[PDB]
């Protein structure tokens, strides 16, 4: 009791310590503390007597009573994705088959008007971060046995596959990747928030009535933030003025497949509406397309790795150096094109590996002084800036050879900073028997390297292609 207080205070101090070479050691340090607290607590404060599926009939009845679609599908525990919706009749592509009225959602607005409302006005984090407001909304209603939203809360999972639930050795597979630093931040964010709100809830007057004051475990918080990150959605407010974050019951039981977004908010009728992404025959699982997220984002925020994610990408940080003889001119061209002199870009799995904005950056980054002047002076300078991201209008063959040479060298260098090779990773997946979470970790580190390798090959092809145009003295597109 008083020992949990001292433990969380220690946790708050360490997790508020600034960024520290030593990121893995800090992660293991925080982990050791977190696990010490968790092992001294009783797991989830509120648990339900039934199995998860025993509550799906109540969800359907409650949703039906409040105007949601409840016919044409059923809940099924699928091995690959967990629970999901399965069609009980044939559903045709583009059919409006699912709808959920606003009254059923949990939103920041409904959090503010809940028992959490006093604390929400007083606390700066809750007012500034709707995702965290949503998480505590979820916890308070979970502990309120007569909550309007109990039918939804009693059908949520009780654990997730976000990295907050990984073993240390499962995270260890990600050492030397880009992704591990986002795993580190999420762990430290969540530990710091648990410690801070544990203190707040124990002492703040406006929290005295919260059921969390009786019991608020680390398990509770990890559960609530993972529920929110894997399921939250952005929707308009009632008046269409602003956006807010919302949990959307029933429809959020749909699992993910490749495609286009087919879910939208109907403001005139004040409900979420989902049309069929494809034909679903009776007996087929109903999927939606979650969004164009990277596999790092799917693993870290959504808790799964999606094979054949055509939107996969890795980050690359680039910038014009202040030590560049042409820094001022390059900075001005970038500013006129609306591009910063330094930021993080992406390398994409699909061809081409770079976006128009990264192509524009690389062209400027590789420009001679005469080329830069052509982008700053004269009536055509604005037109040149306009086409700076267009692969069909090169500044010059020479500029292209230089930028593609740079990208090939840089992607190759990045590949050399990984602890394992692509072939070693494929051998591990082939010959080791792994947990779901371990396989997520290894497929993520493999995919980072596969994206880089494709960028090396694409850049090599482009460099050679533009070398030939430069040798054949070919004319530039006008």
């Amino acid at each position: 009791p008083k020992e949990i207080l001292n433990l969380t205070s220690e946790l708050l101090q360490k997790c508020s310590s600034p960024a520290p070479g030593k990121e893995w050691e800090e992660y293991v340090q925080i982990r050791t503390l977190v696990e010490k607290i968790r092992k001294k607590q009783k797991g989830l404060s509120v648990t339900f007597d039934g199995k998860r599926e025993d509550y799906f009939p109540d969800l359907m009845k409650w949703a039906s009573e409040n105007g949601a679609s409840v016919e044409g599908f059923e809940m099924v525990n699928f091995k690959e994705e967990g629970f999901g919706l399965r069609a009980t009749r044939d559903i045709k592509a583009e059919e409006l088959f699912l709808w959920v009225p606003r009254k059923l959602l949990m939103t920041v607005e409904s959090a503010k008007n809940s028992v959490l409302g006093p604390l929400y006005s007083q606390d700066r984090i809750l007012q500034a971060m709707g995702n965290i407001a949503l998480a505590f909304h979820l916890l308070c209603e979970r502990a309120s046995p007569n909550s309007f939203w109990q039918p939804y809360i009693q059908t949520l999972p009780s654990e997730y596959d976000t990295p907050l639930y990984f073993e240390e050795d499962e995270v260890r597979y990600l050492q030397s990747t880009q992704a591990i630093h986002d795993v580190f931040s999420q762990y430290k964010n969540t530990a710091r928030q648990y410690a801070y709100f544990y203190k707040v809830i124990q002492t703040h007057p406006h929290a005295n009535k919260l059921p969390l004051k009786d019991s608020f475990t680390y398990e509770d918080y990890r559960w609530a933030v993972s529920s929110v990150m894997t399921r939250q959605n952005q929707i308009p407010t009632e008046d269409g003025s602003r956006v807010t974050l919302a949990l959307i019951p029933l429809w959020d039981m749909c699992n993910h497949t490749n495609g286009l977004i087919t879910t939208g908010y109907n403001l005139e009728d004040d409900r979420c509406e989902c049309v069929a992404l494809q034909d679903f025959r009776a007996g087929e699982q109903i999927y939606i397309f979650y969004g164009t997220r990277s596999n790092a984002e799917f693993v870290i925020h959504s808790g799964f790795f999606f094979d054949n994610n055509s939107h996969d990408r890795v980050k690359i940080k680039l910038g014009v150096s202040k030590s560049d003889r042409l820094y001022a001119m390059k900075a001005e061209v970038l500013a006129r094109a609306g591009i910063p002199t330094s930021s993080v870009f992406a390398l994409h799995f699909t061809e081409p590996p770079i976006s128009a904005q990264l192509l524009a950056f690389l062209r400027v980054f590789c420009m001679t002084e005469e080329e830069l002047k052509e982008h700053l002076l004269g009536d055509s300078a604005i037109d040149r800036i306009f086409t700076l991201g267009n692969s069909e209008f090169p500044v010059s063959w020479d500029n292209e050879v230089k930028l593609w040479t740079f990208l090939e060298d840089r992607a190759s260098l990045l590949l050399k900073t990984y602890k394992t090779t692509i072939e070693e990773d494929k051998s591990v997946l082939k010959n080791h028997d792994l947990s779901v979470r371990a396989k997520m970790a290894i497929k993520l580190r493999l995919g980072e390297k596969e994206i880089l390798e494709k960028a090396v090959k694409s850049a090599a092809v482009n460099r050679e292609y533009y070398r030939q145009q430069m040798e054949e003295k070919a004319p530039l597109p006008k």
Binding site: M129, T230, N233, Q234, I235, L267, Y290, G291
Partner: peptide, 19 residues
């Protein structure tokens, strides 16, 4: 499409970088 909904949209959980 009126107000497309990206399901599980990525949000910022870093209270220190945001406050």
């Amino acid at each position: 499409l009126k107000y497309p909904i990206e399901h599980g949209i990525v949000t910022n959980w870093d209270d220190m970088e945001k406050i």
